[PDB]
UniProtKB/Swiss-Prot annotation, chains A, B:
GO cellular component assignments: ciliary basal body; cilium; cytosol; nucleoplasm; plasma membrane
Subunit annotation: Dimer of identical or non-identical chains of three types; alpha, beta and gamma.
A GO MF label: zinc ion binding
Cofactor(s) demanded: Zn(2+)
Binding-site residues for Zn(2+) 1, renumbered to this chain: 46, 67, 174
Reactions mediated catalytically: all-trans-retinol + NAD(+) = all-trans-retinal + NADH + H(+); all-trans-4-hydroxyretinol + NAD(+) = all-trans-4-hydroxyretinal + NADH + H(+); all-trans-4-oxoretinol + NAD(+) = all-trans-4-oxoretinal + NADH + H(+)
Protein name: All-trans-retinol dehydrogenase [NAD(+)] ADH1B
Species whose genome carries this gene: Homo sapiens (Human)
Main function: Catalyzes the NAD-dependent oxidation of all-trans-retinol and its derivatives such as all-trans-4-hydroxyretinol and may participate in retinoid metabolism. In vitro can also catalyze the NADH-dependent reduction of all-trans-retinal and its derivatives such as all-trans-4-oxoretinal. Catalyzes in the oxidative direction with higher efficiency. Has the same affinity for all-trans-4-hydroxyretinol and all-trans-4-oxoretinal.
EC number of this enzyme: 1.1.1.105
Residues that hold Zn(2+) 2 according to the record: 97, 100, 103, 111
């Protein structure tokens, strides 16, 4: 078929920050050893991809973004053992190399092969694999799934049940794993808990579902766009509060209604002020706050150490604490076992060519998740 | 009798900022409903008392300070079931009321009857018990043990072993418990780990001891006053490193030396600089940083969220996370079972009358603990 030689296909290239997508012809080069070329079926538009086109994330340009996705293996490099041609996979946006200090810790998931800390714009081997009009293109977060084909490494590709719906199970690459793992795994939510979840988009609604899942007493979701409330209610929310109806700031309104702080506070928006509301609204001698939202580049918060001395614990994490290559297999098997549902979150399915339109529904706020089909 | 009514004795009166403490004559009105009037026998000087004098801790003046002590029950106020007269007893700078949210909740020890957070200088009910020169005097942290006699509340005092050598055992009243529990109880130092302790005065050295009791493998004790290292070492430190011998900042100094970050970092000092230094030296994808030192009056840190999004967990604590009425007798029981030695922390024993000399000894770096015997 194509394996061995190069494939020429399309992609939605980002050339300039604050500039639209260019769906172009590109040349995706052969899988090297311990790497794999995938053929996409469906990709999801996540707000982390919208942080690079607006300058909040700094990454080398030109670049082809994307990371919540699903596809089928077209070829394997030498000694690739885990997957084989024909197989179904979900590309992981943080790998599980198997050998590093982080990886060895049962409790850590930010493997030392990730491109989040300081972006290289390559694949672990040192190079790139894309060329457009002769100009090579950079790889986003290792995955680069906004293209009709992709080469990712063997330790960052997770195989899934060959009976999975690729057009639904794709949010398990970031959207769900992240939010759900924040509640379930990271914050260690207790049956009885009172949680406050700031932000009602596809990664936060999975934290609402996760809080419910763990046995929360009250789940207070916070947002500015009120059409978000309904869906959240429907997934596990006890009450929904839009901070615009208040005279006192929302950390006060949320404190008074829970007896001076919620048990767990989550911030799934990603902005410097709400990261403080989410610290101030938990209970001062027993709260916990999990930062989930990736913030604006180079900008700092100011906090007085007395806010933590009494006991609030502040933390955060990437991929909901789930070990990419070992955990996503499982999480897909739980989708399949009919244990939870991704259908609530996917609100529109546009073909790949409308990638920018999806980005406009994300910006106006009509989408929980827009899924792109190849 | 001693008991019955108002006692007239000597006390350590702080009438103004940065003043020497006068030893004047005060009157100690008898314990009301559910109160205790203890006679002091041994008190320890702790830098938190000192934080008031220097203005780091605004607390209302005139005042009697001291919260680290032992003595014997004298007159007990009507309704007390907890302790009776003659019991060798230790006061507690954080109450364990039993009934409040924090008290009910299995992890928090910050009882609401505290003037720790927000001060008031009285005993719980709102009134004060000492008068000097027809002027009424405030209390410090509901204890005020720098005095021959004091009136505590019932939910704030602990019953200990009638064999306990007051003079040494008094240290569990702040210094030991805080540092110990900071490792053993809240950082949760897992076995075969690497810990860093910044600061080597009474409480800090108990934090060194606690990390060893938990079973960590490398203990790095960072402190500028070299002299302390001899004790530190002998007590449980692996390598205590002094900050001035370096060219490079102590965070990265420790980062390289530990494969990018120590596992548990504690700051048992109070310098804002050091609270930051300690966060940055713990491992980005699973580091832990407990604040233990009391920051001076409203000097706020500036930090960027990315230090937490990868996995660091920042948090704080009072009383080793030990619930007061409970943990301190248990801990003293282990001390009576020869579990630790408080001899190694006590470096001077002054006659009470010398209160002023002991503060100087603190300020010099000659002392670890100084016991002012009554
Ligand atoms: N931790 C991770 O591993 C990880 C992975 C992916 C994404 N993320 C982060 O999650 C963030 C959220 O992503 P998303 O997928 O949910 O997209 P999203 O854009 O749909 O969600 C944002 C929500 O915030 C709401 N909002 C806006 N202003 C608000 C305000 N001032 N107060 C409260 N709510 C407000 C918006 O209306 C929307 O409901 C992303 O920015 C990204 O940084 C984190
Ligand atoms: N949370 C609580 O329960 C609790 C209880 C008691 C005390 N505290 C606080 O803990 C702190 C310690 O008490 P202590 O009696 O042991 O005081 P201490 O003065 O004896 O300890 C200070 C140590 O820090 C060292 N040091 C000073 N500046 C330094 C710097 N810039 N870098 C590194 N080391 C430096 C000093 O050399 C000394 O070794 C005080 O701030 C006190 O207010 C908290
Ligand atoms: Zn790894
Ligand atoms: Zn994403
Ligand atoms: Zn103290
Ligand atoms: Zn209480």
């Amino acid at each position: 078929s194509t394996a061995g030689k190069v494939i020429k296909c399309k992609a939605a290239v980002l050339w300039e920050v604050k500039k639209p997508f260019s769906i172009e012809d590109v040349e995706v080069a052969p899988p090297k050893a311990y790497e794999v070329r995938i053929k996409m079926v469906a990709v999801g538009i996540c707000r982390t991809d919208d942080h690079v086109v607006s300058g909040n994330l700094v990454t080398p340009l030109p670049v082809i973004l994307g990371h919540e996705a699903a596809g089928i293996v077209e070829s394997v490099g030498e000694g690739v053992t885990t997957v084989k041609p024909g197989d179904k996979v979900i590309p992981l946006f943080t790998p599980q190399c198997g050998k590093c200090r982080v990886c060895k810790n049962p409790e850590s998931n930010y493997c030392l092969k990730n491109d989040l800390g300081n972006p290289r714009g390559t694949l672990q081997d040192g190079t790139r694999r894309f060329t457009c009009r002769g100009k090579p293109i950079h790889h986003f977060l290792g995955t680069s799934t906004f293209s009709q084909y992709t080469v990712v490494d063997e330790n960052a590709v997770a195989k899934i049940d060959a009976a999975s719906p690729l057009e639904k199970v794709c949010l398990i690459g970031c959207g769900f794993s992240t939010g759900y793992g924040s509640a379930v795994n990271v914050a260690k939510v207790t049956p009885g808990s009172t949680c406050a979840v700031f932000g009602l988009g596809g990664v936060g609604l999975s934290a609402v579902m996760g809080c419910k899942a763990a046995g929360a007493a009250r789940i207070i979701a916070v947002d500015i766009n009120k059409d978000k409330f309904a869906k959240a209610k429907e997934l596990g929310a006890t009450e929904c509060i839009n901070p615009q109806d208040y005279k006192k700031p929302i950390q006060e309104v949320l404190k008074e209604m829970t007896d001076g702080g919620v048990d767990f506070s989550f911030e799934v928006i990603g902005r410097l002020d709400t990261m403080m509301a989410s610290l101030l609204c938990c209970h001062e001698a027993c709260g916990t706050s999990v930062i989930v939202g990736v913030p604006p580049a180079s900008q700092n918060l100011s906090i007085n150490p007395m806010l933590l001395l009494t006991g609030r614990t502040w933390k955060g994490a990437v991929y909901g604490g789930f070990k990419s290559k070992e955990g996503i297999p499982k999480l897909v098997a739980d989708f399949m076992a009919k244990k939870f549902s991704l259908d609530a979150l996917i609100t529109h399915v546009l073909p790949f060519e409308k990638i920018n339109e999806g980005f406009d529904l994300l910006h106006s706020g009509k989408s929980i998740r827009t899924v792109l089909t190849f």
